[PDB]
C-alpha cells in the first residue's frame, strides 16, 4: 500500500504532465496521495494563472463576514456576522490596518503559535465564497473555471443526466481568518489555488480516520451534537493541533504559499487559517473514485447547513432514501 503513514505529499509536475488534469489526479492517487486527505501541487515554472494581479481592486465583496469566536483557545466555534459591502481595494487596506495586520513574528511556527494562542480574542473579516475566477481565459492548464463538471462526471459514470452547474469561488483573506473543520459537500474533492498574498496553513485528518475526528467533535461540542447528527457540515467548529494530539487524533499540517495548488480528497477533514492579506480560488470536483463516497456522505438535515442548488441532484440520485428528509431541511 502506497503512503501507509498518510503523510501529505508534494508534487512537481512537468509542463507535459500538467496538460491532462484528470490523468494527474489519478497519478497522485497511484502514489498514495489521497491517504493523507490533502496534497500540494507546485506548478511547472513555465506556467502562470494570469499575467498580473494589478487590476483586481474593483472586485466587490458584497457580504464580508466577521468571524466571531466563542469557547476556549483550543476548542471554539465561530459565527459569521454580515458586514457592509466593500471592494477588494478597501478590504486590502483594512487587512493591512493596525487593528487587523499580521503581527511581527520569526517564522511560520511562531505565527502558528500566536494564531492558536490569540485567535479567539479577535474577530477578523473574511471575503468568502464569491462567485468568480481570476484565471485568464487563455490559461489552458489547471484553469479552475474550465474543469469537467461534477454533473458530467456523474453522467459518465452512472448514465443519468442531471441539472446543475459547478463554478469557482474566490476567497479574500486576512490575518486569523479561519476555515473550520469540514469535508466538502457530498464528500467531493476540492482544489484551491492561492493566487496572491500571504500564506494559508492547513490541517488535515486522513480519510480513513475521519470518524475519529467526528467522535472527538461530538465530545467537545455536546450541544451541537445533540442538535444535528452531522453538525460539522455547519462549518463552525475549531479544534487546535494541541487538542488533537492530546486526544490521539491522527493529522498533518502544511503551509500553502502563493502560486501553489492544494487538493483535498474525498472525506478528508480539513481546517486552517490565513497569515495575512491573500486571495484564493477554489472549486469542487469529482472522479470515478468519488462516487462511492458520495453515496455514503453524511448529511445535515437540521436545516443549518443550507447548500447549493446543485447538491439536490447529487442527494436525489446517490442517496434516494435520504432525499425526502434532507430536502425538508433545505425547505
Ligand atoms: O480557503 C478557504 O478558506 C477554505 N477552502 C477550502 O476549504 C477548500 O479549498 O476546500
Ligand atoms: Mg478590479
Ligand atoms: Ni474545503
Ligand atoms: Zn445540521
Domain ranges of the chain: 1-331
192 within ligand 1 shell (Cβ under 6 A): yes
On whether the CB atoms of residues 134 and 143 are closer than 8 A, the answer is no
- b/e per residue 186-201 (b: at least 16 CB within 10 A): bbbbbbbbbbbbbbbb
* Separation of alpha carbons 326 and 316, rounded Å: 10
N-term to C-term CA, the chain: 44
275 CA to centre of own chain: 16
Angle (CA) 133 128 85, round 5°: 100
On whether the CB atoms of residues 129 and 190 are closer than 8 A, the answer is no
DSSP symbols for 52-103: -STT-TT-EESS-EEEEEEEETTEEEEEEEE---EEHHHHHHHHTSTTTSPP
Which residue, 270, 279, 275, is CA-closest to 109? 275
Which residue, 125, 70, 74, 121, is CA-closest to 277? 125
* Separation of alpha carbons 144 and 134, rounded Å: 9
On whether the CB atoms of residues 176 and 124 are closer than 8 A, the answer is yes
130: cell is 464569491
This PDB structure is determined at a resolution in Å of: 1.7
Q: Is 92 exposed, middle or buried (0-12, 13-18, 19+ CB in 10 A)?
A: buried
DSSP code for 44: P
Phi, psi for 122 (deg, rounded to 5) = -135, 160
List CB-based neighbours of ion ligand 2 within 5 Å.
56, 58-59
Residue 23 burial (CB count, 10 A): 9
Strand order in the sheet with 200-205: 178-182, 269-274, 200-205, 252-256
Question: Which ligand is nearest to the Cα of residue 200, counting in written order?
Answer: 1
Phi, psi for 126 (deg, rounded to 5) = -110, 130
**Hey, whose CA ends up nearest to atom 7 of ligand 1?**
179
**Strand pairing report for 9-11 and 38-41:** parallel
Which position has the grid cell 485568464? 136
* Separation of alpha carbons 212 and 235, rounded Å: 17
114 CA to centre of own chain: 22
Q: Is 293 exposed, middle or buried (0-12, 13-18, 19+ CB in 10 A)?
A: buried
Listed in sequence order, the residues at least 6 apart from 307 whose beta carbon sits closer than 8 Å to its beta carbon are 185, 330
* Separation of alpha carbons 175 and 321, rounded Å: 43
**Hey, whose CA ends up nearest to atom 4 of ligand 1?**
179
| Alpha helix positions (H), 120-209 | 150-158
**Rg of the chain's alpha carbons, rounded to an integer?**
19
On whether 184 is known to bind a ligand per the annotation, the reply is yes
Listed in sequence order, the residues at least 6 apart from 130 whose beta carbon sits closer than 8 Å to its beta carbon are 59, 61, 62, 169, 170, 171, 172
Q: Is 121 exposed, middle or buried (0-12, 13-18, 19+ CB in 10 A)?
A: exposed
Q: How much distance in Å is there from the Cα of 89 to the middle of ligand 2?
A: 8
Listed in sequence order, the residues at least 6 apart from 53 whose beta carbon sits closer than 8 Å to its beta carbon are 134, 195, 196, 279
284 within ligand 1 shell (Cβ under 6 A): no
Which CATH superfamily, name and number, covers 1-331? Cupin (2.60.120.650)
Which position has the grid cell 476556549? 72
162: cell is 442531471
| Alpha helix positions (H), the chain | 21-30, 88-95, 108-118, 150-158, 210-220, 222-227, 241-246, 290-296, 311-318, 320-330
Q: Following CA atoms 199, 236, 217, 275 in sequence, which dihedral angle do they give, to the nearest 10 degrees?
A: 10
- Helix, strand and coil content of the chain, in percent to the nearest 5, comes to 30, 25, 45
On whether the CB atoms of residues 179 and 228 are closer than 8 A, the answer is no
β-partners of residue 271 are: 203
Handedness of CA 150, 152, 154, 160 (dihedral sign): positive
On whether 48 is known to bind a ligand per the annotation, the reply is no
Structure determination method: X-ray
- b/e per residue 228-267 (b: at least 16 CB within 10 A): bebbbbbbbbbbbbebbeeeebebbebbbebebbbbbbbb
Q: How much distance in Å is there from the Cα of 159 to the middle of ligand 1?
A: 30
The Cα-based distances of 266 to 5, 184, 204, 282, 283 in angstroms read 18, 7, 12, 15, 13
Amino acid at each position: 500500500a502506497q503512503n501507509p503513514n498518510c503523510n501529505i505529499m508534494i508534487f512537481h509536475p512537468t509542463k507535459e504532465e500538467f496538460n491532462d488534469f484528470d490523468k494527474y489526479i489519478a497519478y497522485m492517487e497511484s502514489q498514495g496521495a489521497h491517504r493523507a486527505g490533502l496534497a500540494k501541487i507546485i506548478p511547472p515554472k513555465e506556467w502562470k494563472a494570469r499575467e498580473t494581479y494589478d487590476n483586481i481592486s474593483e472586485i466587490l465583496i458584497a457580504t464580508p463576514l466577521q468571524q466571531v469566536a466563542s469557547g476556549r483557545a483550543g476548542v471554539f466555534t465561530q459565527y459569521h456576522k454580515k458586514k457592509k459591502a466593500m471592494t477588494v481595494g478597501e478590504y486590502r487596506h483594512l487587512a493591512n490596518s493596525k487593528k487587523y495586520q499580521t503581527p511581527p513574528h520569526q517564522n511560520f511556527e511562531d505565527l502558528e503559535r500566536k494564531y492558536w494562542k490569540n485567535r479567539i480574542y479577535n474577530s477578523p473579516i473574511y471575503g468568502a465564497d464569491i462567485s468568480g475566477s481570476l484565471f485568464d481565459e487563455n490559461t489552458k492548464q489547471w484553469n479552475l473555471g474550465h474543469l469537467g463538471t461534477i454533473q458530467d462526471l456523474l453522467e459518465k459514470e452512472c448514465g443519468v443526466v442531471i441539472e446543475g452547474v459547478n463554478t469557482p469561488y474566490l476567497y479574500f483573506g486576512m490575518w486569523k481568518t479561519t476555515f473550520a473543520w469540514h469535508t466538502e459537500d457530498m464528500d467531493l474533492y476540492s482544489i484551491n489555488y492561492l493566487h496572491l498574498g500571504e500564506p494559508k496553513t492547513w490541517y488535515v485528518v486522513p480519510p480513513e480516520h475521519g470518524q475519529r475526528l467526528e467522535r472527538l467533535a461530538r465530545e467537545l461540542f455536546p450541544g451541537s451534537s445533540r442538535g444535528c447528527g452531522a453538525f460539522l457540515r455547519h462549518k463552525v467548529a475549531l479544534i487546535s493541533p494541541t487538542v488533537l494530539k492530546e486526544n490521539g487524533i491522527p493529522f498533518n499540517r502544511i503551509t500553502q504559499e502563493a502560486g501553489e495548488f492544494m487538493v483535498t480528497f474525498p472525506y478528508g477533514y480539513h481546517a486552517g487559517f490565513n497569515h495575512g492579506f491573500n486571495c484564493a480560488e477554489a472549486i469542487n470536483f469529482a472522479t470515478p473514485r468519488w462516487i462511492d463516497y458520495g453515496k455514503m456522505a453524511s448529511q445535515c438535515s437540521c436545516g443549518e447547513a443550507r447548500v447549493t442548488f446543485s447538491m439536490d441532484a447529487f442527494v436525489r440520485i446517490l442517496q434516494p432514501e435520504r432525499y425526502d428528509l434532507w430536502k425538508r431541511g433545505q425547505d
